[PDB]
Amino acid sequence: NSIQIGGLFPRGADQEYSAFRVGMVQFSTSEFRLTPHIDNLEVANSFAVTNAFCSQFSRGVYAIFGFYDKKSVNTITSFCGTLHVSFITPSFPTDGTHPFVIQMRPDLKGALLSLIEYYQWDKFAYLYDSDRGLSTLQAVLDSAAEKKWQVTAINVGNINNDKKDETYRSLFQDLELKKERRVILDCERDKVNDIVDQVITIGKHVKGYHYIIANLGFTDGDLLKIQFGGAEVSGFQIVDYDDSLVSKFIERWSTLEEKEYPGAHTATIKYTSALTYDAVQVMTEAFRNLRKQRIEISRRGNAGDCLANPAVPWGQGVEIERALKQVQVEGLSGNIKFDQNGKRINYTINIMELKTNGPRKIGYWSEVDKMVLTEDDTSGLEQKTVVVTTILESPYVMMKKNHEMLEGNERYEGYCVDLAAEIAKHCGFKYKLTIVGDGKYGARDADTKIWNGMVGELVYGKADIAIAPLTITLVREEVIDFSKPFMSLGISIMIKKPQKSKPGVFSFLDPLAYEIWMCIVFAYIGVSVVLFLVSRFSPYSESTNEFGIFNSLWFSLGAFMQQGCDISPRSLSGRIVGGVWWFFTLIIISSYTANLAAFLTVERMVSPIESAEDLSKQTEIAYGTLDSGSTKEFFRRSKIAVFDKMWTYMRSAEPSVFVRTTAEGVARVRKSKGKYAYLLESTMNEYIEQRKPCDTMKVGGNLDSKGYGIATPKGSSLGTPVNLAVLKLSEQGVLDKLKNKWWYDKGECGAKDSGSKEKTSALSLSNVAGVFYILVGGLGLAMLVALIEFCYKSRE
Amino acid sequence: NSIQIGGLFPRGADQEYSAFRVGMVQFSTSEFRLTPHIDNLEVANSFAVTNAFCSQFSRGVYAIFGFYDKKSVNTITSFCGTLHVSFITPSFPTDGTHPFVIQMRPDLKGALLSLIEYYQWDKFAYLYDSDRGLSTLQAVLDSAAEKKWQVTAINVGNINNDKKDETYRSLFQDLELKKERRVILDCERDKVNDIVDQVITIGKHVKGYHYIIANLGFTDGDLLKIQFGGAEVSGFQIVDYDDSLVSKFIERWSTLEEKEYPGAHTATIKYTSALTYDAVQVMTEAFRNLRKQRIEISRRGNAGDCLANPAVPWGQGVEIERALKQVQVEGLSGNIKFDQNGKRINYTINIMELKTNGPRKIGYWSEVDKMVLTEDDTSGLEQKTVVVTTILESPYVMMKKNHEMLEGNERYEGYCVDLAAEIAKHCGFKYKLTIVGDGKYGARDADTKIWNGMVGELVYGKADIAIAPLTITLVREEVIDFSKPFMSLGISIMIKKPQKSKPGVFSFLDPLAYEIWMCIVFAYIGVSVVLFLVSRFSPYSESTNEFGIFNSLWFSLGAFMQQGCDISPRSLSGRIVGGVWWFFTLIIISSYTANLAAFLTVERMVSPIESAEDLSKQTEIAYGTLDSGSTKEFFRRSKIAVFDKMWTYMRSAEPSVFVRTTAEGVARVRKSKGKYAYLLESTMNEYIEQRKPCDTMKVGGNLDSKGYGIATPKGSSLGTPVNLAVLKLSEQGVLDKLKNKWWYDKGECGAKDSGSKEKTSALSLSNVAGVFYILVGGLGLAMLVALIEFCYKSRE
Ligand SMILES: CC1=NN=C(c2ccc(N)cc2)c2cc3c(cc2C1)OCO3
Ligand SMILES: CC1=NN=C(c2ccc(N)cc2)c2cc3c(cc2C1)OCO3
Ligand SMILES: CC1=NN=C(c2ccc(N)cc2)c2cc3c(cc2C1)OCO3
Ligand SMILES: CC1=NN=C(c2ccc(N)cc2)c2cc3c(cc2C1)OCO3
C-alpha cells in the first residue's frame, strides 16, 4: 500500500514545490512511491494551518512535511506532540526539545559565534528580523555578556512593508553616530537584499566595512552588487556546490523545463529547497526501512478531527518517529543525522568570504571542531618563520632575565629585535631570532679561502636573513646583499676613564714649574754673590758689615723664605740688592700660594689620548680591535697614512691585542688599568659609556664612517622588500624614535651630566709628605756636618 | 501662404520630435503656417545626411532644422555654406565660424572653466566622450597649460557599442594610481549614467569625491542614485524649472498623453527638446518678422539638385539668415540672442549642486558676469561679523613692524582668535581684531557704579566676543561668562635685576665680619695687658726687659701685622703669650686672605626680596599693580593675612603706586633703579624676563592660581561652541605648542649654568681706596701728635 504523506507549503514557494516534485521523481522506486496531497497556506495564520493540519490528519496522512513560521511553530509543535504525528520541516529549528519534529535546518548560532570569534569582534551591530525567532539574538546577547562584547541589536522586521520598505537610511546614521563598521545581517534573502541595496545607496559597502550574512544561503542572494565595493562580506553555506551529489543534481536542475519546474533552470539552488529535497530523501528512506523491518503501520482511512475528547493518538507513531530519527544518509546539505530530539548532528557548515573574484570557501564548522580552515592554498614557502641570525651584545640583542620559560622572540629585546619586528610588519612575514653559531660577525680568512659557518648556512638557506648589527663593507657586499643603512657611525677608540691624579712625593713643587725652580736657585746664588761683592770690595777698618759670603747667602735665604735676618745692609747698593730680592720673593711666594689655591679648586687634570694621533705615536698603551669584525678588515685595507701606521702597529704587536667578543674587549680595558685601549664602533662605545660603571669613555673623533645594514643572501627575493621597508623607516623617522629610546632615554651615567659638586677635603699627609722627608734628611745632614766638624777640630 | 521647412531628426529622438510638434502647435498662427517635411535617419552617416539634405533641397525648403554629429557636422556646414541654406540646430556648436548655421546650444567651455576655478581645482581627471566634439577638451588643456593644472584626460567614449564592456573599473583603478578624487564627466546623459552606475558599483560615490557633470542637462539625468552617497555632484542647467514660462510649459507638458507624444507626461524634459522648442519659437519669429517687412520670400520656382555645376545659390538665403540672426526672444532656455556667427550670446547657465534633498541652484554664469552666486538661502541670519576685542600686550597681541601699510587682521596676530572664529565661520563670516576703546581690562567703580569701557562694551553688545589676556574672576562671572581657561598663570612680583655690588669705602673689612674685628681689637688689648703683667710684676729686680705697657702694645701690634719686632719675651710666661698670639694672627690672616680669594672668584646676586612676606615686611620697597586689572580686585577680595597686609599697604600708600598700562609699570621698574616692584601676571614676567634688556626678573612664587579665558556677553550663543573649541584645543595639545613657540622658543636671554665664569680683571683702586684714606689720616694724626709733643716740651 502506498504511503500517504501531507504537504504544507507556504504561498509563493514555487521553488520548494519544484524541488519536492524533483525529489519525488528521483527517489521513486519499483516497490512503492510516496503520494503527497498538498495544500498551500498562509503559514503565518495559525487558523489556516490548523485547518490544513486537520484536513490532512483526517485524510489518513502518516507523516506531514511542510513549513511553519514564528506565528505557527507553536500550533504545529503542539498538534504534532499531542496526536503523535511526525513533522519533517526545513524551517527554523524549534527553541525547545520538541518531540515528533524532524528538523532539517542545522543550528546556526554556534557557527555564527565561532565566526565572530574568528575575526576577534568585540563591538558590532546585530540587525535581526524576528520572522525566524529571536533564538540567535538571545544567543549573541548571552555570549556578549559572557565574552564582553558590545552589541547594538536593531529590529528591521517592523518596517511596514504593506506600504513601504525604506527606513534604513535613518537607521544607518545611528550606526554612524556609534562608528559601527561591523554589522551582522540576521535576515533572510529578501531582507538582506534590501539591506545591501540601502547600504550601497548610502555608500557603506566600501573598504573598512565588514558584513556577516547570518543565514545558510550566502550564495542564494545577489552578492554581485556588493562584490566590488571593497567591503568584506562573509557568511555561511550549507550547499557546497563543489561536491559530487550537488553537481549531479545541478546538471539536471539547470536543464529542467522552467514552466514545468518553476524556480529551476538555474546554476544555483536556494538552501531551503535543497533541504526540502534532502527531507524527501530522509523520509522515503525511513519508510523503506520501516517496510524492510517488516513493521506494519496501516490504519483506517478516518481520524478524530483533532478535536475528539480525549485525544486519540495511534500507537505506531513512535515507531515512525524512531525510524525518521535513525535515518542517516548523504545528501545535498552534507551528512544528515538527527539526535533523539530531531536536531541535526554531525553536520558541517561552510564559512565563505566574498572576494573580488567571487564568493569562495574559507573553512568549515562542525559539532566536534569549531571553525576549522579549509587548508586550501597550502603553505610550504612563506608560512615558516624566517631564521634571523644575530649576535648577542648589550645595545642590540640582549638575553632577558626570565629565560627559564621565555620563547625565541620573547627572550630578546633591543634595537635589532624591534627593528626586525617593524621590518617584518611592513614586509608581511613571520620570523624567529637566532644567535650566530660561530659567535662572531665573521670575515674571510686570508690566503686560505676558508669561510666561517655564516657563509655556508646562507648558501644552504639555513641562515634565511641576518637582521643583526652587521656593518656595510665592500668585501661582504660582493658576497651577500645589503640593504640601505639604518644607522651611520664609525670606529672609535675607547679608553679607561682616568682617575684623580695621585700626589707624588715631591708634589710641593708642582704649582710653580721646574724652570722657575731652576731660575730661583740661580737667582739666589746671583743675589748672594752680588750682595757680598757690593758689601766687601773696599767700602772704606775691614768687616764694617757682617755680610761675608756665607752671611750674604744666609741673608738671601732668609729673605726668600720670609724670615727676618739678624743683619740688614746699610749701604745704598747693598740695600738696592736687598729690596729687589724682597720684591722678587714677595711676587714668587704670592704666585705659589695663588697657583696652589687655583689647583686645589677646579678638578679634571690631564687626559691620556685626545684624537688617536697620539695613540699611534705612543707605544706604552697597547690597543686592538675585535677579531674577524669589520673594523679589523677596515684597518687592513686602509691606505690613509695614520690608519696604515695603526695597522702596521696592530699587526706586529707581541701580545694579542685582539679579542673575540666586545665584552672581552671591555673587560680587558677595565682590567688593564688604563694601559689598554679598544677600537670599537661609536654606538656601542656610547652605550657602554652611559652604562654603569662609568670607568670608560669615548675619545677620538669617530675615525671612519660606516653604516649598519640588514644582510641578505645573494639573489634572495627578500632583498628588495626589506630594502624598501628600511628606506620607509628612515624617511618616516621611526628609527630615530628607537635610537632615542635605546640611547638617550637611558642616560644612567650621572657623572657625565656633572650636576653634582664636591666639597673640598683636608689636605692629606701625602700632599705634603715630601717636605717632611726633606726636613728629616736635612736634620740628619746637619748632624753629620756637626759631627764632622767636631771630629776635625778635636785633632662590529 | 505656407512656408515649407525641413527636418533632420535622428532615429530615436522621440522627445525631440514631440517637443517639435508641441512648439508647432503652440506657436501656430493664422496669418501663416510652417509646413515641416521630416526625414528620420542616422545622423552619424554622412551619406544619409547628405542625401536627405538634397532630397529636402529638391522641394524648395526655406530652412532646415535638424541635428548632426561629429561625423556629420562638416557636411552640414559645407552644404549650408555653399547653397546658402540656413541650418538651425540644437546640436553642439561648431568649432569655428560658419555662416548659415544658427546654433541654439550655448557654449559650455567658459562655464566649465569658471566652475573648475571656483572650487580652486588644480589636479583633476577629465573623462570625455568623442561624440560631442573635443573642443571642450582642447579648451581644458589650453587653460591647464596657462593655469598649471594637472589634467588626466581619458577617452571614455573609445569603448563604443561594439567595445561594450564593464571596463570602467580598470579606468577608475587607473585613476587611483594618482589619487584623483576630482572627476569631470564630459559625456551625454547615457554615458554619464553608465559612469555613475560604475562609480556606485565600486564605491566611488562616497564623501571625498567630487564630480562635475559637464553638460547642460544636470537635472534631466538620473541623479537620485548618487544623491545619498555623500560625494559632491555639481553641474550646469540651461532650463530653469523655477521660471514662470518654463513652469507654464511643464504644467501642460506633464498632463499630455504619452502614448501620442513619446517623452511627454514627465515633470522634467531633456534640454535638447527644450532647445528644439526654442528653435521653433525663433524660426517662427524670424518668418513673422520677414512677413512684416514684406520681403519677397517667394522662391524662384524649382530649386534643383545639390550637384549643380556651378553650384549657384539663391539670393534670398542671406536675407533669411540675417532675419534668423537678429531674432531676440525669451523661451525655455532663457534669453535667446545670436551674434553674426550664429553663436548664442547673452545666455545664462545655471550652476547647480546635488544636495541630500535634491539638486539646487548655487549661482549663474553669463558672458558679461561670470559665476555670480545667487546667495539664496545663504544670505540669512545682528552684526554680520564678530568684532573681537583685544588689548595690546606684547606676549599676546603685538603691533606689527609694518603698521604703516598693513590692513585687517594681518596687522596683528592670534591663534586662539582664529580658533574661536572658526565658530564665526560656521555662522558664516570672518573675525575682526579690534582694540578695546579705553585700553583697560575694566573694573567696576566702587560705591559709584560707574561703568568702565570694558564694563559697557562687553555688555552693550558693542563687542560680541573678546580675546585678550583677560583673567577669570568671580566679579565678572555675574555680568559676563567665560569659557574654560586655556592657560594657567599667577600674580607675580617683578623687580629690577640687581647690578654687581660696588665696593664701599671700608670694603677691606668685608671678608671677616664686624664681630671678628671687635674681638680682634679686644684680644689685642688683652694680649698686650697680660704680656705686660707677666713680664713686669716682680721677677726674682724689674726693668730686665723692655716690655713696658707701651712696648707690649707695640710688640702685639707687630705680631698681628706679621712685621718683625725688636724685642722678644725671653721668659716662659711671656713666651706662652707670644706664641699663642702668633698662632692667633697666623690663623686670622690666612682666613682673611682665603675668604677674600673666595669672594673675588664667585659672584652671588642675592635678590633684595624673595617672597610676598618680604614685600609686606619691607616698608622702603614701593610695590603696586595695574589699575582696573584683575590683580587689584584680587588684593581687595583676599582675606589671606599676608595679602590683606599687602592690600592695606597699597590702599593707603605713598603717591600713587598704581599704573595704567603694563608698559608704564615696566618703565617705572626700570626707571626706579631698584626700589620699585611691580605685581603682574606671571606669563608676562617670563616674557619680559626673556626679552632684551634683561634688567628685570621674576622673584618669589606665584601669589595665586588664575587663568585667562574667552570673554562673551551673558547668554550669547557663542559661549558653548568656543568653550568646546578651547577644551578640544587643550586635549589636542596645540596650546602647549603655542606656549613653547611664544615663550620657550624665543629664549634670547637664557641663563648659564654654575660654570662659564667671566674673567677676573684687575682689582680697582675703589676696592682698596679706604685703606689709603686711613693711611693718610694716620700720617696726619702722627704729625699732630708730634707737634703737640714738641710744643709741650718747648715750655590682568
Ligand atoms: C695631586 C696634587 N696635589 N697636591 C699639590 C699640592 C702641592 C702643595 C701642597 N701644600 C698641597 C698639595 C699639587 C699642586 C699643583 C699641581 C699638582 C699637585 C699634585 O699642579 C698645579 O699645582
Ligand atoms: C695672563 C696673565 N696670567 N698671569 C697674571 C700673573 C700675575 C702674577 C703672577 N705672579 C703670575 C701670573 C695675571 C694676573 C691677573 C690678571 C692678568 C694676568 C695676566 O688680571 C687679574 O689678575
Ligand atoms: C665689592 C667688594 N669688593 N671688595 C672686597 C675687597 C676687600 C679687600 C681687597 N683688597 C679687595 C676687595 C670685598 C670682600 C668681601 C666681601 C665684599 C667685598 C666688597 O664679602 C666677602 O668678602
Ligand atoms: C664648615 C667649616 N668652614 N670653615 C673651615 C675654616 C677653617 C679655618 C678658618 N680660619 C675658617 C674656616 C673649614 C675649612 C676646611 C674644611 C672644613 C671647614 C669647616 O675642609 C677643607 O678645609
CATH level 3 topology of B2-104+266-343: Rossmann fold (3.40.50)
Ligand 2 contacts CB of residue A591 (under 6 A): yes
Residue B500 CA, closest ligand 3 atom number: 1
Residues A266 and A253 sit within 8 Å (Cβ to Cβ): yes
Question: Looking at beta carbons, which pairs linking A111-115 to residues 24 or more positions away fall under 8 Å?
Answer: A111/A236, A111/A349, A111/A351, A111/A365, A112/A136, A112/A139, A112/A140, A112/A184, A112/A212, A112/A214, A112/A236, A113/A139, A113/A140, A113/A143, A114/A365, A114/A370, A114/A371, A115/A212, A115/A234, A115/A236, A115/A351, A115/A365, A115/A371
How far apart are the C-alpha atoms of A318 and A324, rounded to whole Å?
A: 10
Q: Where are the beta strands (DSSP E) in A530-653?
A: 622-625
What is the nearest CA distance from B701 to chain A, expressed in angstroms? 24
Residues from A contacting B (CB-CB < 8 Å) are 169, 200-203, 205-207, 225, 228-231, 564, 594, 597, 601, 757
Residue B199: phi, psi to the nearest 5? -60, -45
For residue B703, the 8-state DSSP code is S
DSSP percent split of chain A into helix, strand, coil, nearest 5: 40, 20, 40
**Which residue, judged by its Cα, is nearest atom 8 of ligand 2?**
A591
Q: Pick from A724, A716, A725, A684: which is nearest to A702 by CA?
A: A684
Strand order in the sheet with A232-237: A150-155, A123-128, A182-186, A210-213, A232-237, A348-355, A358-366, A372-373
How far apart are the C-alpha atoms of B672 and B148, rounded to whole Å?
A: 63
List the single residue in B with minimal CA-CA distance to A756: B754
**Which residue, judged by its Cα, is nearest atom 11 of ligand 3?**
B767
| B493 DSSP β-pair partners | B679, B699
- Count CA within 13 A, CB hemisphere, residue B22: 29
For residue A263, the 8-state DSSP code is T
Distance from residue B498's CA to the centre of ligand 3 (Å): 18
On the 0-12 / 13-18 / 19+ scale of CB atoms within 10 A, A773 is exposed
Measured from the Cβ of residue B92, the count of other Cβ atoms closer than 10 Å reads: 21
Sign of the CA dihedral running B68, B73, B75, B79: positive
Distance from residue B560's CA to the centre of ligand 2 (Å): 29
| Topology agreement, domain B2-104+266-343 and domain B109-237+348-373 | yes
CA distances from B458 to A520, A752, B25, B707 (A): 86, 57, 69, 19
B471 is in an annotated binding site: yes
Interface mutation vs chain A, best among B168, B172, B228, B232, most A CBs within 10 Å: B228
How far apart are the C-alpha atoms of A338 and A346, rounded to whole Å?
A: 8
Residues of B with Cβ-Cβ distance to A231 under 8 angstroms = 203
Which CATH number is B494-499+606-704 given? 3.40.190.10
Residues of B with Cβ-Cβ distance to A205 under 8 angstroms = 203
How far apart are the C-alpha atoms of B466 and B713, rounded to whole Å?
A: 9
CA distances from B588 to B453, B534, B578, B602 (A): 69, 25, 15, 22
Residue type, B497: K
Strand order in the sheet with B182-186: B150-155, B123-128, B182-186, B210-213, B232-237, B348-355, B358-366, B372-373
Q: Where are the domains of chain B?
A: 2-104+266-343, 109-237+348-373, 386-490+710-740, 494-499+606-704, 507-601, 766-795
CATH level 3 topology of B507-601: Helix Hairpins (1.10.287)
What is the nearest CA distance from A554 to chain B, expressed in angstroms? 17
Exposure string of A514-525, with b = 16+ CB inside 10 Å and e = fewer, is eeeeeeeeebbe
Helices B572-601 and B549-560: angle between axes, nearest 10 degrees: 40
Task: Calculate ∠ Cα B8-B10-B14, nearest 5°.
Answer: 110
Which CATH number is A4-105+256-336 given? 3.40.50.2300
| B88 DSSP β-pair partners | B65, B102
Residue type, B329: V
| Overall size of chain A counted in residues | 796
Residues B360 and B433 sit within 8 Å (Cβ to Cβ): no
Distance from residue A506's CA to the centre of ligand 1 (Å): 9
How far apart are the C-alpha atoms of A617 and B486, rounded to whole Å?
A: 64
How far apart are the C-alpha atoms of A601 and A619, rounded to whole Å?
A: 33
Distance from residue A761's CA to the centre of ligand 2 (Å): 27
Strand order in the sheet with B334-338: B329-331, B334-338, B344-345
CA distances from A186 to A108, A154, A167, A191 (A): 10, 10, 17, 9
List the single residue in B with minimal CA-CA distance to A757: B754
CATH level 3 topology of B109-237+348-373: Rossmann fold (3.40.50)
Residues of A with Cβ-Cβ distance to B229 under 8 angstroms = 201-203
Distance from residue A776's CA to the centre of ligand 1 (Å): 21
Task: Calculate ∠ Cα B329-B330-B331, nearest 5°.
Answer: 120
A437: left (phi over 0), alpha (psi -120 to 50) or beta: alpha
Q: Which ligand is nearest to the CA of B516?
A: 4
Among A201, A206, A597, select the one facing B597 at the smallest CB separation: A597
Residue A509 CA, closest ligand 1 atom number: 7
B552 is in an annotated binding site: no
Q: What is the 3-state secondary structure (H, E, C) of B82-151?
A: HHCCCEEECCCCCCCCCCCEEECCCCCHHHHHHHHHHCCCCEEEEEECHHHCCHHHHHHHHHHHHHCCEE
On the 0-12 / 13-18 / 19+ scale of CB atoms within 10 A, B516 is middle
On the 0-12 / 13-18 / 19+ scale of CB atoms within 10 A, A56 is buried
A473 is in an annotated binding site: no
How far apart are the C-alpha atoms of A613 and B176, rounded to whole Å?
A: 59
Residues B223 and A195 sit within 8 Å (Cβ to Cβ): no
Using most ligand atoms within 8 A of CB, pick from A760, A761, A763, A764 the residue to mutate for ligand 4: A760
Helices A415-427 and A719-732: angle between axes, nearest 10 degrees: 110
Among A203, A564, A594, select the one facing B205 at the smallest CB separation: A203
Q: Which ligand is nearest to the CA of A501?
A: 1
Residues of A with Cβ-Cβ distance to B231 under 8 angstroms = 203
B162: left (phi over 0), alpha (psi -120 to 50) or beta: alpha
CA distances from B74 to B90, B93, B358, B477 (A): 16, 12, 40, 80
**Which residue, judged by its Cα, is nearest atom 15 of ligand 4?**
A762
Distance from residue A588's CA to the centre of ligand 2 (Å): 12
The answer to whether the CB atoms of B229 and A203 lie below 8 A apart is: yes
| Overall size of chain B counted in residues | 796
Longest alpha-carbon distance in chain A: 183
How far apart are the C-alpha atoms of B677 and A62, rounded to whole Å?
A: 110
Q: Pick from B19, B12, B11: which is nearest to B36 by CA?
A: B19
Ligand 4 contacts CB of residue B587 (under 6 A): yes
A356 is in an annotated binding site: no
A377: left (phi over 0), alpha (psi -120 to 50) or beta: left
List the single residue in A with minimal CA-CA distance to B199: A229
CATH superfamily of B386-490+710-740: Periplasmic binding protein-like II (3.40.190.10)
How far apart are the C-alpha atoms of B655 and A671, rounded to whole Å?
A: 76
